[model samples]
Each structure stands twice: as C-alpha cells, then as structure tokens.
Target chain A: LSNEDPKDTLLREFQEEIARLKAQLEKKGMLVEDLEKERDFYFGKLRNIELICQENEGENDPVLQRIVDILYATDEGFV
Target chain B: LSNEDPKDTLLREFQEEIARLKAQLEKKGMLVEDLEKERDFYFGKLRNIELICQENEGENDPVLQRIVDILYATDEGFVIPD
Candidate 1:
C-alpha cells in the first residue's frame, strides 16, 4: 500500500484473471483435439461396416430392411 | 430342417455391430458440438479481457510483464508442413 498506486493494483488483478482464462482455454483446446481423434476412429469403423453392408445388399431380409430404415430416418445432417 | 444360410447369419451379426457403432458415434458427435460451443464462449470472454488489458497499456508492472511472457512462450501457431 505504501508505494502501489490504484491502477497498478487493478492491472495486477486483471492480469491474474487473464492468466486463469488462458489456462482454461489451453485445456479445452487439448480436449477438442482428443475428441477429433475419436471421431476419426469412428469414421474408419463406419466405412468398414458400410462395405460389409454393401457386399450383402442382395439378401433383402425384412429385419435388415427395418434396421436400415431406422438408420436412414436419422441420417439428416447436423443443424 | 429349415434354416438360414451361413452368409445371412454373418450379415445379421455385422449389422448388429454396425448399429451399435452408429448409435455411439451419434452420441459422441453431439458431445463434440456441445464442447465446441463451450470453447466459443471462453473465446468471447478472453477477447473482452484482452481489450481491457490493452486499454491500460501505460502500466509497467513486472507481474504483467511476466504474465505476458508466459502467454507468448506458448503462442506458436499450430504445426503446418510445407
């Protein structure tokens, strides 16, 4: 209190808050990267699954058709 | 005996696995979107705070200098190959 001015103290406090926000942003960036990797993994699995489904397209089982219908219903792209 | 052929059985099993994966992937996709919104919120707050810091540029506090140094150290852009 002896030598510190009001603006200096305010600046110090604001800098601390900025530092905290920076740390939070860094953590979230890493989390997004991890999710991206997982999404890629699922994409790979889905591609292989699609290949299998196509190979047996001629079977025409009713149960399989029902399942396909369900999948198509939600095939709408993300909003 | 009446029975399904071997390929039919294999195909049915594969369909089950595909359905399971599809359901899980749908859930994860929504989760990722939610996380993205949260990240955007944080970015908004950070930008406001930065503007405030810039407005008080005349202050020459050592603590602020140290904090700025730390921020700059990790300011490198994301990896890109030529």
Candidate 2:
C-alpha cells in the first residue's frame, strides 16, 4: 500500500464498487424478469379462462358449472 | 328483436364479452401495479441496507449490530413447514 498513488487507489476502489453494483443490478434485473414472466403467465391464463367462461356462460352442463364455480372461487383473491 | 339477424345477436354478445373482460383486465392491472409497488419498496429497502452494510464493514456499533442481526434473521425463506 505504500508505493501506490492515492488517486490510483481511489480510482480502483470506485471501479470495484461500480463493478459490484453492476453485477448486483443485473441479478436484480433477472429476478424482476422472472417475476414478469410469472405475471404474464397468469395474465395469459386469466385471459384464456375469461374466454372460456364467456363461451360457456348460461350452459347447463354440470361439468362446465363446476369449472366455472372453481374459477369464480379463484377470482376472489390470490392465495 | 325478432327482426334482428342471428349473426348480429352473436356479434353483440361478443362485443359485450370483450367489454366485460376489458374491465376485469383493468382491475387485475391495478392489482399488479400495487404488487409491483410493494415489491419495489422491499427492493429499495434491501439495496439501502446492503449499502449501509458495505459502508460500515467491520464497525463495532451496537445499534448497527442489532439491525444487522435483525436483517440477517429476515433473510430466510417465507414461512413454510420445513
């Protein structure tokens, strides 16, 4: 530590901090990406469920009625 | 109503369904926005805590130590049976 110029040491420290932050940001970016993918997956599922529910509305089929009930139950809130 | 074509009735039904789904989508969109805000809040908190930890590395402050312990305790997974 004696021979190194002070400015050079500070510059290197700054670079190291920046590098650590960059990697941290990317890790968080990936986490957000995963969350977004999961969000969109549910979005698509809801869209399809809505379509099917619309198609089967007013139908008297017992199976369809059961499915609709389950979907309605799920529509209440997230688990 | 008797004079209306069947196709017209079906088309109107489709449009109504579209409108209904659009409203539902907007509701879910708002829910997602709320969730995103919550997630961002925690993310910012974590980042701040990490910065402080880096800045105070090796410090012997008691309050800081307690906070660090609390933060470490919270680092575990969500409550679930092991």
Candidate 3:
C-alpha cells in the first residue's frame, strides 16, 4: 500500500515538492505584514494588559512579577 | 475555606503571583514600561479582581467595564483616562 511504483513515487514526490514551494510563497507574501501586525497587536495587548494588571495589584505592593506570568507566562514554570 | 494544600495559596493568587513571576523574569524586567506607570500600576490590581470572570471577555474596554461593574462593586475601580 505504501509503495505503488517507481514512476508513481516520483510523481508523488514532485507534488509534495510543489506543495512545499507554494507554502513558502504564501508565507513570504504575508511575512512583512505578519511581522508588523503581530508586533502592533501583541504589544498593544501587552501594554493594556500591564496597565490592568498593575492597577489590580495595588501600587504600594508592586506585584509586577505576577502580572508577567499571568499574561506572558513564567520562566520557572510556576504559573 | 477550601484548603487544596494551601501550599500555592500563600499569595493573593493575582498580585502575589504576578509580582513573584515578574521578579523571576530578569531579561525583560522593564516589562510594559511604556504605559502610564501610576495608571498601569492600579490597572493591574483591578484587572486581577475582574481577572476571574472577565478574562476572555472585554480585553479592550477596562475603564468603561469597571465603571459598569462598580455600580454594584464599588467606585474605587473607577479611573478617568487622561
């Protein structure tokens, strides 16, 4: 079932190769846009999230460490 | 109270956990320094309280949402954007 014939296998590989190439082209078309959009959206979310987190934590305590984890994730994997 | 080990409950879960993680993250220590420091500071605390039920909802409207909720909660959550 896996291998039908040498010529058929070659054709399958060629089709697979085409898919890979097309995927690259599609990704490249959106590369620049994706980078800029991702940066803007995530950063905006980050800023807004940070502001919200801080206000909740209280000024005197300075619980930024918690905000970091809740939004971005923790380094030590505690959260 | 429900003691599920109480091992992880030392902190207020919101503030303490956030502060704890922030201290651990060194490279990006100055995280989100671009926001209004004073405003952002208070924002975090308020966010965490509403963090429970409001997590996935209004990721955008905080102040306005706070106002509506505070009608029953309290006015301390109110913050006029400057």
Candidate 4:
C-alpha cells in the first residue's frame, strides 16, 4: 500500500533538525537590535569623554593624552 | 508483514526545510561578524576608558570626575540622541 520505500527514520531526523535549527540564535532575528543598542550606547559615552578632554586640551594634561590614546586604539596585542 | 508505512512526502518536506535553513545561513552568515565588529569596536574603546579612569581616580581632579561620570551614565534622554 506504499508508493515508495519508507523514509520514517530519516524524516524524524530532519524533523528534529528543523525544530533545533529554528531555536538557534545565530540563525535568527532581533539580536541585531541588541548589538546596535550597545554599539551606539558606548560610542556616545566615549565621545562625550573625548569632548570633555578636548575642553582641557590646552592644559597639556598627560592623563587626557592617555585617554585620547586609548580611544584611538586599533589593536589589542601582547602585554 | 512490511512493518513500515512510507513517509516520502514528509521526508521530502523536512529535507526541503533543512535545505532552506542552510541556504538562509549561507546567505546571511556574515551578519554575525558585522554585529560583533560593531559591538566589539565600541566596547573596546570603553575598555580603555575604564582602565584610565581607575588609575587617575585618586588624582581627585574635576576633569577626571567629569570623564568618569560620562562612563557611568545610563539613560540618554533629550539633547538629540545617544
């Protein structure tokens, strides 16, 4: 009473796979919202720090210079 | 006794489900890296800010406090946007 060979076991395997994949984070949505919120949030904080440092730039402040240096950092290397 | 009823229809459907999922991953795979880069880049700047703030914290300078205050901020309301 069948049109072809049985595929129950393989079908169950893929059915579970569909359920599992749908549950994954990397394969889904809304995380972009979280990332954007944080990325923009910290950039504001850092930029305000820069502005505050700029106002006192004429002081020849070493601490402010250190702050600026850290802000512009491009690489994180060995200690 | 055959002991088995065919599931070829559901089998093919689930197979297509797997294929579509994989294709979506392939097409949108680089998105995670971009989000990570954005997330890491900004967080990196603050990482150093925290480092600098801690050492100069004992200096008791008003400018240092001003810089530190910005770091501790939470809500960004009014005045354009964060």
Candidate 5:
C-alpha cells in the first residue's frame, strides 16, 4: 500500500492552475515567474496543512479530499 | 461501495523528486528544456504505481479509506485530518 494517490494528478489541471494563479498574482502585481514560485510555495503550505490535520485524525481518513474540497469550496475558480 | 480513494500521490509527488530527476539527467549532460514532459512522465509513473497497486487490492472496498491509513502509515509526512 506504499503506492501513490491518483486523483491528485495535476493533469491538464496544471496548465489551468498556472493560468489562474498567474492571473490572480498578476492582479496583485506579481510576475509570472514569481507566481510560479508562489504557486509551488502555497501547494507546500497546503500539503503541510493537510499533513498536520491528517496527523491528528489519522492519515487514512480521506483528509486530503476534504482539504481539496475546502480549497475548492469557493467558486472563485479552479479544477 | 462506489468509492474514490484520494491518496493519489501522482498529483503531489515530492518537489525533491523533480530536483532529483533534473539532477540525474543533468549529470548525463542532458539539458532539461522538456521539463514539462519529464514531469508528466514521472506522474505517469506514479499513477501507474497506484493503478497496479489498487487493481490488485480489489475496488470498492467498504473501507477504501483504509488505503489512506496505509499512506499515512509513514511518519515521514502526514496530511491534514478531516
């Protein structure tokens, strides 16, 4: 059971995310390059946050999906 | 039980992995202009790992959530709790 998860596949989602994040960052006056770093940074933060929560509940609790749901809870946008 | 086990690391492999891949290739003196391709290729690897593992495990387990338990069985990293 040491294999990877499949749903998280960035897929075409990476391009979509890059575009959305770039737009949001640019609106904040950030460069595309900077936004790329920021995106990576935020994902790390998200993972950390997810990991912390999972630690408390138990890793196998489908917490990642919950975090993902929260991340998308807003219609502000993203796939 | 129809289920979607969300332990999919194919979507979230370690950043260190990307660097390692780049380093290994660079050591071969291969410039990484096609980074996006490499990234996708590894993801494919990760996904295949998942599918094969899950395929053998049998699907729709009443407790597919247990797969997640196996994922976090590691002390190296933990995800947020629901």
Candidate 6:
C-alpha cells in the first residue's frame, strides 16, 4: 500500500542497522579478548622456556641453544 | 524558522552510530588477525623447540626434559611445567 512515510522507513532501518552493528562489535570484542589472552599465554610459555635455556647456558647444551634461538626471534615473521 | 528537522538530527545520529560501530568492529577484526598471527608464531616456536627437545630425549638431559614438559602443555592455562 506504501502507506508508511519514507522518513519512518529509514528511521526504522537505521535502528536495525545500529543494533546489528552493535551485536557484531560485541561479538568481535569478546573474540579479541580471548585471542589476546591466548597470545599472551603462549608467549609466557616461551618466556619460561627461554629462562630455562638461559639458566643452563653454562653447560653449553646444544639443544637448549636451539630452543633459545627460536625464542629470541619472538618478533620475526612466519615466512 | 532555520531549525533543522528532527528527523535530520536522528538520521545524523544514527549515521554516526553506524560509523562508530563499523570502525570499532573493523579495528577488532584487525586485532584478531594480529593475535592470530602471534598465536601461530608462538606455536611454531614451540613446535621447533619441541623438535629439539624430543630429538635429544636420548641424552636424558634433565633440562631438555623440562623444556619438553613446557612445550607439551600447549593447552595448559599458562602454568609452568613442574
């Protein structure tokens, strides 16, 4: 029938758009936090691994040296 | 009167809200990718470290075993291996 005013239609659409965007944003926010936690957690494991390698450096253990080398490149790209 | 229409104000506000949420969501998506890269980076290191640790298991070095223990717990809650 096209009885609704154009402005009202747009207003309702905007409301729906805002709601949908807000929902995705919230979902992404939760995912971000979980990922951050996971990234830091694994990093801590690396740090502990490095600490052990460092403490044992005096022994000249070749394997520990290998682990240390990988740990040192914490900022390097994958490829 | 020179006053703007009420609908115009609401439209502007909703536009701004959509823009803000879109920008925020975009930023979150980028951060998620960054974290994803970081996560895999650490995983690779652990895999390599574990490679060394496992390869040298024959030596019976206590330190290597300890390192192995740490990398083995990939699913652990950040607790250091005992």
lDDT of each: 0.44, 0.48, 0.44, 0.70, 0.41, 0.78
Give me the runs in candidate 5 sitting further than 4 Å from their true place. A1-30, A58-68, A72-79, B1-82
- Model 3 reproduces a share of the real contacts of 0.00
Q: How far out, in Å, is residue B62 in model 2? A: 9.8
Q: Compare candidates 2 and 5 on TM-score and give the better one.
A: 2
| Deviating ranges (above 4 Å) for candidate 6 | A74-79, B74-82
Per-prediction fnat: 0.03, 0.00, 0.00, 0.53, 0.12, 0.67
lDDT of 3 at B15: 39
Candidate 5 lDDT, A5-50, residue by residue in tens? 3344554455455455445444443333444443444444335544
Q: What is the per-residue lDDT of model 5 for residues B1-82, given as tens digits with 9 covering 90 to 100?
A: 4254434343344433444544554443322233334344433333332343365474554333443353334343334444
DockQ winner among the candidates? 6
For model 4 chain B, the run of ten residues with the poorest summed lDDT: B73-82
DockQ of each: 0.02, 0.01, 0.01, 0.37, 0.07, 0.59
Global Cα lDDT for candidate 4:
0.70
Question: Evaluated against the true chain A, what TM-score does chain A of model 6 have?
Answer: 0.83
lDDT per residue for candidate 1 within B14-76, as digits (tens), equals 556555655555565567797666444433333332343355577773433332332233332
Q: What is the DockQ of candidate 1?
A: 0.02
| Poorest stretch of ten by lDDT in candidate 2 chain B | B73-82
Off by over 4 Å in 3: A1-29, A52-78, B1-82
Please give me the total number of clashing residue pairs in predicted model 1. Answer: 0
Q: Which stretches of candidate 4 lie over 4 Å from their true place?
A: A1-27, A76-79, B1-20, B26-29, B77-82
The whole-model C-alpha lDDT of candidate 2 against the native structure comes to 0.48
Instruction: Please give, for residues A4-76, the per-residue lDDT of candidate 1 as tens digits.
Output: 8655555555556555555655565667687655444433332332333344451364433332332233331
**Interface RMSD for each of the candidates:** 28.1, 23.2, 20.0, 4.5, 20.9, 2.6
Question: Once model 1 is optimally superposed onto the true structure by TM-score, how far is the C-alpha of residue B23 displaced, in angstroms?
Answer: 32
